[PDB]
A paper describes a structure:
We show that Bcd1p binds [name] and controls its transcription-dependent recruitment by reducing its association with RNA polymerase II, modulating H3K56ac levels at gene body. We reveal the 3D structures of the free and [name]-bound forms of Bcd1p using nuclear magnetic resonance and X-ray crystallography. Bcd1p interacts with a region that is distinct from the interaction interface between the histone chaperone and histone H3.
To understand the mode of interaction of Bcd1p120-303 with Rtt106p65-301, we characterized the 3D structure of the complex using X-ray crystallography. The final structure was refined against the dataset collected from a native crystal to an Rfactor of 21.0% and an Rfree of 29.7%, including all reflections between 20 and 2.79 Å resolution. The three loops in bound Bcd1p encompassing residues 173–177, 211–224, and 248–252, respectively, were not built due to the lack of density explained by their high flexibility in their native free state. We concluded that the conformational changes induced by complex formation mostly occurred in [name]. The crystal structure of the Bcd1p120–303:Rtt106p65-301 complex revealed that [name] interacts with Bcd1p only via its PH1 domain. For Bcd1p, the interaction interface mainly involved the solvent-exposed faces of helix α1 and of strand β6 located on one edge of the central β-strand. A hydrophobic cluster formed at the heterodimer interface with side-chain interactions of four hydrophobic residues from each protein.
Author numbering:
A (entry chain B): 128 to 172, 178 to 210, 225 to 247, 253 to 301
B (entry chain A): 66 to 118, 121 to 205, 218 to 298
Write the structure that this text describes.
Amino acid sequence: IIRRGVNCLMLPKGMQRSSQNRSKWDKTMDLFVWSVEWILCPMQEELFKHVSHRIKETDFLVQGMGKNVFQKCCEFYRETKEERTQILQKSGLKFYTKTFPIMDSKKLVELAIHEKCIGELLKNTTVIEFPTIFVAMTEADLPEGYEVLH
Amino acid sequence: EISETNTIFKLEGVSVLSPLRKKLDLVFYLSNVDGSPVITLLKGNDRELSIYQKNIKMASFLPVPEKPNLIYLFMTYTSCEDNKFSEPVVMTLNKENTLNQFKKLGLLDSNVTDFEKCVEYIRKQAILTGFKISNPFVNSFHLQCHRGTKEGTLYFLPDHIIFGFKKPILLFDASDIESITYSSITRLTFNASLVTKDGEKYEFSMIDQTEYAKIDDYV
């Protein structure tokens, strides 16, 4: 099913992921909101995953992170949304979602988080239920099996 | 083979003590070969043990003597992959961790603090994997005792008795219990002996006397 441009693959409901999707159209706010799966890749020589809910389609990507998730970036690397949002922008963290031609993928595309809102970053893509979004200082750190396309 | 698209349930970080000692991940998923459900334990993407479906005979959440941040999931089975093991699956979930993990999966909100919410969820995914996990300490009871020289926990459930968890782990279906005969050693402590319909005797010694009442009542 296709919400707000985004092409969304829907798993059978029994599936854990299906129950971890809360992406919906939100009446009062008058827009679409988005669960994303954050996967933080720290600096190797162990992952931290977190799923945020009700992120506003009209928000830059850093804007809809989440305290805990920031905190956790702040420990893998180096406090109101205002600042948090501001400290990740001058940060050097690259952000990769994954890319598709039902089937999982290990092909990633880096995305230009500061030059677009989530809704635009997602418009003509595919997600499995809802975006997964990898975070790392370098590619080396992304999980093994995962390969980025430039 | 297994990923987010055929994974029924996935909990990282369980402390498997039988049929092996190791920190593992617990996973229910439907095989992409034939749509069939499977229980596996993973090390990253190793599979130390997989059970396919029938196969699981009995499974249950059990408390950990004297340790409430902790909980056993106990599962018995007719067979597994390569017959690598035979002994029952005992593992130990941490409560607090379980909650925070359910939270980091977005399965439960920041505020929720009742573990039985996790438990509800595990029991349900399990039914989706062709099997029941009972939860009889939410009328059951357990006590300490010894077999020969080894201490263990004797748990008394509605339809089973389990003696755990040093190898060999015993399970007795209640309907297989011909008799339990009692025997004093002190005013403070006694021995109980189970007798199976096929004549095997199992001498559960050194039970505290305060437990006597609960055992008679059970029969």
